[PDB]
Coordinates of all heavy atoms in Angstrom, one line a residue:
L243 N 74.2 -91.0 17.4 CA 73.4 -91.3 18.5 C 74.1 -91.0 19.8 O 74.7 -92.0 20.3 CB 73.0 -92.8 18.4 CG 72.1 -93.2 17.4 CD1 71.6 -94.6 17.6 CD2 70.9 -92.3 17.4
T244 N 73.8 -89.9 20.5 CA 74.7 -89.5 21.8 C 73.7 -89.6 22.9 O 72.6 -89.9 22.9 CB 75.0 -87.9 21.7 OG1 73.9 -87.2 22.4 CG2 75.1 -87.3 20.3
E245 N 74.3 -89.3 24.2 CA 73.5 -89.6 25.4 C 72.7 -88.2 25.7 O 73.2 -87.2 25.5 CB 74.4 -89.7 26.6 CG 74.9 -91.2 26.8 CD 73.8 -92.0 27.5 OE1 72.9 -91.5 28.1 OE2 73.9 -93.3 27.5
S246 N 71.5 -88.4 26.2 CA 70.5 -87.3 26.2 C 69.8 -87.1 27.7 O 69.7 -88.1 28.3 CB 69.6 -87.3 25.2 OG 68.2 -87.6 25.8
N247 N 69.6 -85.8 27.8 CA 68.9 -85.4 29.3 C 67.5 -85.3 28.9 O 66.9 -84.4 29.5 CB 69.4 -84.0 29.7 CG 70.9 -83.9 30.0 OD1 71.5 -83.0 29.6 ND2 71.4 -84.8 30.8
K248 N 67.0 -86.2 28.1 CA 65.6 -86.0 27.7 C 64.8 -87.0 28.6 O 64.4 -88.0 28.0 CB 65.4 -86.3 26.4 CG 65.1 -85.0 25.4 CD 66.3 -84.7 24.5 CE 66.7 -83.2 24.5 NZ 67.2 -82.9 25.9
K249 N 64.5 -86.7 29.8 CA 63.6 -87.6 30.7 C 62.2 -87.6 29.9 O 61.5 -86.7 30.2 CB 63.7 -87.1 32.1 CG 65.1 -86.9 32.7 CD 65.0 -86.2 34.1 CE 63.9 -86.6 35.0 NZ 64.4 -87.6 35.7
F250 N 62.1 -88.7 29.2 CA 60.9 -88.8 28.4 C 59.8 -89.3 29.5 O 60.1 -90.0 30.5 CB 61.0 -90.2 27.7 CG 61.3 -90.0 26.1 CD1 62.2 -89.1 25.8 CD2 60.5 -90.8 25.3 CE1 62.4 -89.1 24.4 CE2 60.8 -90.7 23.9 CZ 61.8 -89.9 23.5
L251 N 58.6 -88.8 29.3 CA 57.5 -89.2 30.1 C 57.3 -90.8 30.1 O 57.5 -91.2 28.9 CB 56.1 -88.6 29.6 CG 55.9 -87.2 30.3 CD1 54.3 -87.0 30.5 CD2 56.6 -87.1 31.7
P252 N 57.2 -91.5 31.1 CA 57.2 -92.9 31.0 C 56.2 -93.6 30.1 O 55.4 -94.6 30.6 CB 56.8 -93.3 32.4 CG 57.2 -92.2 33.3 CD 56.9 -91.0 32.4
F253 N 56.0 -93.4 28.8 CA 55.2 -94.1 27.9 C 55.4 -93.8 26.5 O 54.7 -94.4 25.6 CB 53.6 -93.8 28.0 CG 53.2 -92.2 28.0 CD1 52.6 -91.9 26.7 CD2 53.5 -91.3 28.9 CE1 52.2 -90.6 26.5 CE2 53.1 -90.0 28.7 CZ 52.6 -89.7 27.4
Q254 N 56.4 -93.0 26.1 CA 56.5 -92.6 24.7 C 57.7 -93.3 24.0 O 58.4 -94.1 24.7 CB 56.6 -91.1 24.6 CG 56.3 -90.3 25.8 CD 55.7 -88.9 25.5 OE1 55.0 -88.8 24.5 NE2 56.1 -87.8 26.2
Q255 N 58.0 -93.1 22.8 CA 59.0 -93.8 22.0 C 59.6 -93.0 20.9 O 60.8 -92.9 20.9 CB 58.4 -95.1 21.6 CG 59.3 -95.8 20.5 CD 60.5 -96.4 20.9 OE1 61.7 -96.0 20.5 NE2 60.4 -97.6 21.6
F256 N 58.7 -92.5 20.0 CA 59.2 -91.8 18.7 C 60.0 -90.5 19.1 O 61.3 -90.6 18.7 CB 58.1 -91.3 17.9 CG 57.5 -92.4 16.9 CD1 57.2 -93.7 17.3 CD2 57.3 -92.2 15.6 CE1 56.6 -94.7 16.4 CE2 56.8 -93.1 14.7 CZ 56.6 -94.4 15.2
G257 N 59.5 -89.6 19.5 CA 60.2 -88.4 19.9 C 60.5 -87.4 18.7 O 61.6 -87.7 18.0
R258 N 59.8 -86.4 18.4 CA 59.9 -85.6 17.2 C 60.3 -84.1 17.6 O 60.4 -83.9 18.9 CB 58.8 -85.7 16.3 CG 59.1 -86.3 14.9 CD 57.9 -86.2 13.9 NE 57.0 -87.2 14.4 CZ 56.8 -88.4 14.0 NH1 57.7 -88.8 13.1 NH2 55.9 -89.3 14.4
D259 N 60.2 -83.3 16.8 CA 60.5 -81.7 17.0 C 59.4 -80.9 16.5 O 58.4 -81.4 16.2 CB 61.9 -81.3 16.4 CG 63.1 -81.8 17.0 OD1 63.0 -82.3 18.2 OD2 64.2 -81.8 16.4
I260 N 59.7 -79.5 16.7 CA 58.7 -78.5 16.0 C 58.7 -78.6 14.5 O 57.6 -78.7 13.8 CB 58.9 -77.1 16.6 CG1 60.1 -77.2 17.6 CG2 57.7 -76.5 17.2 CD1 61.3 -76.4 17.0
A261 N 60.0 -78.7 14.0 CA 60.1 -78.6 12.5 C 59.9 -80.1 12.1 O 60.4 -80.5 11.0 CB 61.6 -78.2 12.1
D262 N 59.3 -80.9 13.0 CA 58.9 -82.3 12.7 C 60.2 -83.0 12.3 O 60.3 -83.7 11.2 CB 57.9 -82.5 11.6 CG 56.7 -81.5 12.0 OD1 56.2 -81.4 13.0 OD2 56.4 -80.8 11.1
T263 N 61.2 -83.0 13.2 CA 62.5 -83.8 12.7 C 62.5 -85.0 13.9 O 62.2 -84.6 15.0 CB 63.7 -83.0 12.8 OG1 64.5 -83.3 14.0 CG2 63.5 -81.5 12.7
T264 N 62.9 -86.2 13.5 CA 62.7 -87.3 14.6 C 63.9 -87.4 15.4 O 64.6 -88.4 15.3 CB 62.6 -88.7 13.8 OG1 62.5 -88.4 12.4 CG2 61.5 -89.5 14.2
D265 N 63.9 -86.4 16.4 CA 65.1 -86.4 17.2 C 65.3 -87.6 18.3 O 65.3 -88.6 17.8 CB 65.2 -85.1 18.0 CG 66.2 -84.0 17.4 OD1 66.4 -84.2 16.2 OD2 66.8 -83.2 18.1
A266 N 65.3 -87.3 19.6 CA 65.6 -88.2 20.5 C 64.7 -89.5 20.3 O 63.6 -89.4 20.0 CB 65.3 -87.8 21.8
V267 N 65.3 -90.7 20.4 CA 64.6 -92.0 20.3 C 64.9 -92.9 21.5 O 66.1 -92.7 21.9 CB 64.8 -92.7 18.9 CG1 66.2 -92.7 18.4 CG2 64.4 -94.2 19.0
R268 N 64.1 -93.6 22.0 CA 64.3 -94.4 23.3 C 64.9 -95.7 23.0 O 64.4 -96.2 21.8 CB 63.2 -94.3 24.2 CG 62.3 -95.7 24.2 CD 61.3 -95.7 25.3 NE 61.8 -95.3 26.7 CZ 61.3 -94.5 27.6 NH1 60.0 -94.1 27.1 NH2 61.8 -94.3 28.5
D269 N 65.7 -96.2 23.8 CA 66.3 -97.5 23.2 C 65.1 -98.3 23.3 O 64.4 -98.6 24.2 CB 67.3 -98.1 24.2 CG 68.4 -99.0 23.5 OD1 69.3 -98.4 22.9 OD2 68.0 -100.2 23.3
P270 N 64.8 -99.2 22.1 CA 63.7 -100.2 22.3 C 64.0 -101.2 23.5 O 63.1 -101.6 24.2 CB 63.7 -100.9 20.9 CG 65.1 -100.6 20.3 CD 65.6 -99.3 20.8
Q271 N 65.3 -101.6 23.5 CA 65.6 -102.7 24.6 C 65.5 -102.0 26.0 O 64.8 -102.4 26.8 CB 66.9 -103.4 24.3 CG 66.7 -104.7 23.2 CD 66.3 -104.2 21.9 OE1 66.7 -103.1 21.4 NE2 65.6 -105.1 21.3
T272 N 66.5 -101.2 26.2 CA 66.7 -100.6 27.5 C 65.7 -99.3 27.6 O 64.9 -99.0 26.7 CB 68.1 -100.3 27.8 OG1 68.3 -99.7 29.2 CG2 68.8 -99.4 26.7
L273 N 66.1 -98.6 28.8 CA 65.3 -97.2 28.8 C 66.2 -96.0 28.7 O 66.1 -95.1 29.5 CB 64.6 -97.3 30.2 CG 63.4 -98.2 30.5 CD1 62.6 -98.4 29.3 CD2 64.0 -99.6 30.9
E274 N 67.1 -96.2 27.8 CA 68.0 -95.0 27.4 C 67.5 -94.3 26.4 O 67.0 -94.7 25.4 CB 69.5 -95.5 27.2 CG 70.5 -94.5 27.2 CD 70.8 -94.0 25.6 OE1 70.1 -94.9 24.8 OE2 71.5 -93.0 25.4
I275 N 67.8 -92.9 26.4 CA 67.3 -92.0 25.3 C 68.6 -91.4 24.7 O 69.3 -90.6 25.2 CB 66.3 -90.9 25.9 CG1 66.9 -90.3 27.1 CG2 65.0 -91.5 26.2 CD1 66.3 -90.8 28.5
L276 N 68.7 -91.7 23.4 CA 69.8 -91.2 22.5 C 69.3 -90.2 21.6 O 68.5 -90.5 20.7 CB 70.6 -92.3 21.9 CG 69.9 -93.6 21.7 CD1 68.9 -93.6 20.6 CD2 70.9 -94.7 21.5
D277 N 69.6 -88.9 21.7 CA 69.2 -87.9 20.7 C 70.0 -87.9 19.5 O 71.3 -88.1 19.6 CB 69.4 -86.6 21.5 CG 68.6 -85.4 20.7 OD1 68.4 -85.6 19.4 OD2 68.1 -84.5 21.4
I278 N 69.5 -87.8 18.4 CA 70.1 -87.9 17.1 C 70.6 -86.5 16.6 O 70.0 -85.6 17.1 CB 69.2 -88.7 16.0 CG1 68.2 -87.6 15.5 CG2 68.7 -89.9 16.6 CD1 67.4 -88.1 14.4
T279 N 71.6 -86.5 15.8 CA 72.1 -85.4 15.1 C 72.4 -85.6 13.7 O 72.6 -86.5 13.2 CB 73.4 -84.9 15.9 OG1 74.4 -86.0 15.8 CG2 73.3 -84.5 17.4
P280 N 72.5 -84.5 13.0 CA 72.9 -84.5 11.6 C 74.2 -85.2 11.3 O 75.1 -85.2 12.2 CB 72.9 -83.2 10.9 CG 71.9 -82.4 11.9 CD 72.1 -83.1 13.2
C281 N 74.4 -85.9 10.2 CA 75.6 -86.8 10.1 C 76.6 -85.9 9.4 O 77.3 -86.3 8.4 CB 75.2 -87.9 9.1 SG 76.5 -89.2 8.8
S282 N 77.0 -84.9 10.2 CA 78.2 -83.9 9.9 C 78.3 -83.6 8.5 O 79.3 -83.9 7.8 CB 79.4 -84.5 10.4 OG 80.6 -83.8 10.1
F283 N 77.3 -82.9 7.9 CA 77.3 -82.4 6.5 C 77.7 -80.8 6.5 O 77.4 -80.2 7.5 CB 76.0 -82.6 5.7 CG 75.0 -81.5 5.9 CD1 74.9 -80.7 4.9 CD2 74.1 -81.4 6.9 CE1 74.0 -79.5 4.9 CE2 73.3 -80.5 7.0 CZ 73.2 -79.6 6.1
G284 N 78.2 -80.4 5.3 CA 78.6 -79.1 5.2 C 78.6 -78.6 3.7 O 78.0 -79.1 2.8
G285 N 79.7 -77.7 3.5 CA 80.1 -77.3 2.1 C 81.5 -77.1 1.8 O 82.1 -76.4 2.7
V286 N 81.8 -77.5 0.8 CA 83.4 -77.4 0.5 C 83.5 -76.2 -0.4 O 82.9 -76.0 -1.3 CB 83.8 -78.7 -0.5 CG1 85.3 -78.6 -0.7 CG2 83.6 -79.9 0.4
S287 N 84.6 -75.5 0.0 CA 84.9 -74.2 -0.7 C 86.3 -74.2 -0.9 O 87.2 -74.3 0.0 CB 84.4 -72.9 0.2 OG 83.1 -73.0 0.5
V288 N 86.7 -74.0 -2.1 CA 88.2 -74.0 -2.6 C 88.7 -72.7 -2.8 O 88.2 -72.0 -3.7 CB 88.3 -74.9 -3.8 CG1 89.9 -74.9 -4.3 CG2 87.7 -76.3 -3.6

């Protein structure tokens, strides 16, 4: 959950994408918007 420049229009909350991924979410308590990112996954190659 990082800090975002997503000035949300003053009435929304969910925040999704075109590929329908649930990105930015607004803080339920405060009015801060934290954009989410994948949990650092990849592939191991030996």
Side-chain angles (χ1 to χ4, degrees):
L243 283 197
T244 95
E245 271 280 344
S246 101
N247 292 133
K248 257 109 228 64
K249 309 165 44 83
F250 260 43
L251 272 216
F253 61 101
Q254 348 209 39
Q255 159 79 246
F256 274 49
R258 243 184 290 268
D259 285 347
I260 358 114
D262 319 308
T263 107
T264 348
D265 262 24
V267 36
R268 97 169 316 137
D269 206 89
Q271 272 68 34
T272 181
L273 292 318
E274 184 271 348
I275 46 264
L276 19 78
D277 198 334
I278 77 174
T279 54
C281 189
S282 180
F283 89 98
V286 181
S287 303
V288 180

